[PDB]
Amino acid sequence: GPLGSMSMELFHGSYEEISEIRDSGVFGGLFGAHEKETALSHGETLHRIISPLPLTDYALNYEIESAWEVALDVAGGDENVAEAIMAKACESDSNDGWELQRLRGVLAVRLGYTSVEMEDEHGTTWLCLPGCTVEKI
């Protein structure tokens, strides 16, 4: 679909002023919240992130044919972590939670998306990957 037709609007708080979303950092992107108030609790400078096409958790597990094999390829064949990154919580007793979150971001890039539904203390947040637009205030 024409780019922008599915865009969702999120906010990111940081100490920096973000120009673009580099393929770098712990997660390979930025986390966005639905409420400006939530983003400000994470930083002083507020940003607007716009993901042209986000990947909902439902669409991941239920509407995308053979996403499991793609999650397997990014998990190095370890079917225990691939199972963990198909789900928002990104939880397993054997792996680092944030590396699970990063690998979940890799999934969406592989599947052709630019943000992924995530779970966190706030509730649902989104890992916004390169492809989104970030702009201050």
Ligand X SMILES: NC(=O)c1ccc[n+]([C@@H]2O[C@H](COP(=O)([O-])OP(=O)(O)OC[C@H]3O[C@@H](n4cnc5c(N)ncnc54)[C@H](O)[C@@H]3O)[C@@H](O)[C@H]2O)c1
Residue (3 or 26) nearer to ligand X, CB: 26
Residue (78 or 91) nearer to ligand X, CB: 91
Alpha-carbon gap, residue 11 to 39, rounded angstroms: 6
Name every residue whose Cβ is closer than 8 Å to that of residue 96 and which is 6 or more positions away in sequence. none
Q: How far is the CB of 69 from ligand X (least distance, A)?
A: 27
Interior angle at CA 60, CA 90 and CA 30, nearest 5: 55
Segment near ligand X (CB under 6 A); pick from 58-66, 75-83, 106-114, 117-125: 117-125
CB 115 within 8 A of CB 32: yes
Instruction: Count residues near ligand X (CB under 6 A).
Output: 21
Whose CA is closest to 85, among 125, 117, 52, 51? 117
Q: How far is the CB of 77 from ligand X (least distance, A)?
A: 26
- Give me the residues that bind ligand X (CB under 6 A), please: 12-16, 18, 21-22, 24-26, 29-31, 33, 39, 42-43, 120, 122, 125
